[model samples]
Structures are given as structure tokens and as C-alpha cells.
Target: MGVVILVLTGDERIAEELRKEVQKHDPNVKTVPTKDKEKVKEEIEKARKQGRPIVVFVRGGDDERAKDIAEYAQKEGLRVIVIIVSQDEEALRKGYEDKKKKGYDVYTSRNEDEAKKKLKEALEKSGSLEHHHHHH
Candidate 1:
């Protein structure tokens, strides 16, 4: 089974970049814009059922939409990795930590490269990259 990766980005430029990176590594990756809160929730739920890990990319500081999406993903038993594109690393880390305290599996990345690394780590830990072969 292929991993269903959910790529969330707030900006179009960043989303495009992430799409390219994810596709380059994993062909089955899917990208989604996190502008609409409802759509974000729906995508997370769908990915969770598909047993795919989700990565949410956000800019600026504590984002309400990202927080909501992460919480929803956690409720569905999916690990949520949040990428905060801001210079204030402390604020970004605190934002994610606040969500973590609420019982959410959240991690923060300062930049796109770090975010991708974190995402790959999450998928690996979940065994999303394990090779399986079966003959029937």
C-alpha cells in the first residue's frame, strides 16, 4: 500500500514548492491548500482513513486554521507535522507546543527544508515507507 501524504500550505508559492518536493520523493503524495478550515478538516479525515500521514505548512505565527486542522488530524489518529515559515522560531515552537499540551502529536519546523525532513521522518516512523511484497 502506498502512503497517502497530505501536504497543506497557506501560500500558493510555498504549496507549489512543497508539491514538487513531495512528488520528487513520493509519487503518491497529495497536496492541499489550507485556506479553508472546513476543507482542511475534510482532507485530514479522508487521509486518516487511508492511513496516510499528514503534513501542514503554515506561515507567520500561531495560526488558528493550522491549529484546528492539527487538532482534527489528531482526533482521527493521524500524526500532524506543522511547518511554520517565520523567523521567530521561539514563537512558532511555542505555538506547536501549546497544541501538543492539548494532546496533539504536533511538531514545528522553521523552514521548508526542515519541514520536509520532519515530514519524511514522521512517515518513516509510521512505517509508511516499508516495502511489502505478497503473492496470492
Candidate 2:
């Protein structure tokens, strides 16, 4: 098994696309897309054993659930990245800070390109790019 990152997002349309884009940069990183809270929790727990993981939250509507997940995951001492993606930056400004306050490393991107850019930055910044080296 390799590094499997959870890409939780309300926007199902862009979830897979975002994962695919990120995969272009890091072939080892696989993304699981879902907006379900329990699934997010389950994935977090499952990935915890492997190492620190990254969780991307793409905003489509309710951001409170995202914040809730971030809070619990970090509370459990899981080092994860919370990426808030949205085309409209105005809508996610509040949610971004909310995530930050919860001890989640938050990054907001205006589009898919910028999302990948931000992702690469975080991966390199944390050495996750080197850690997740292959896929299952």
C-alpha cells in the first residue's frame, strides 16, 4: 500500500479532478473524495497509522462539517493539511480562519491550478512529497 490522501469536499464535481491534478505531480498520492463526515473520520483514523496525512476540503456549501472534522483529527494528533478550495474566495474567508483556529494547517485556492500549486507547496514544505513515494 502507498500513500492515500483523503480529499473531502462538498463539490463532488471537482473532487476527482483535483485528485487527478495532484496525482500528476505526485503519482503516489491517491485521493478519496467524499463529503460525508463519518467517512472523513474513518479515513482519518485509517490513515493515521501510516503517517501524517493531508485532507483537502473543497467548499461547495456547508463548511462547518469540514471544520468539525479538522478539529477532531487534529485533536487526535494527526498532522493533516486542510485545503479549502473554491472559485469564489469571498465565500470561504470565514471558513478558512475557522479551520486555522482549530489547529488545522489551512490553505485556500481560487481554482484547480492554484489548488495544485498550494498542494505542491505543502507537500514540499512538509516533505510529504518525498514520503509518499509510490501507490498500491
TM-score of each: 0.68, 0.71
TM-score of decoy 1: 0.68
lDDT of each: 0.54, 0.57
Instruction: Quote the RMSD, in angstroms, for model 1.
Output: 6.3
lDDT of 2 by residue, 1-136 (tens): 2122323344677676876666665554434556454566776666556454444444466566666666666677665566666776665576567666866666777766666666766656544564343345
Across residues 5-114, which tens digit of lDDT does each residue of candidate 1 receive? 33333344665677566555555444565444356566565655655554444445327666666666666556555544434667656766776686655555555666
Worst 10 residues of 2 by lDDT: 1-10
Worst 10 residues of 1 by lDDT: 1-10
lDDT of 1: 0.54
Model 2 stretches astray by more than 4 angstroms: 1-11, 24-30, 52-58, 130-136
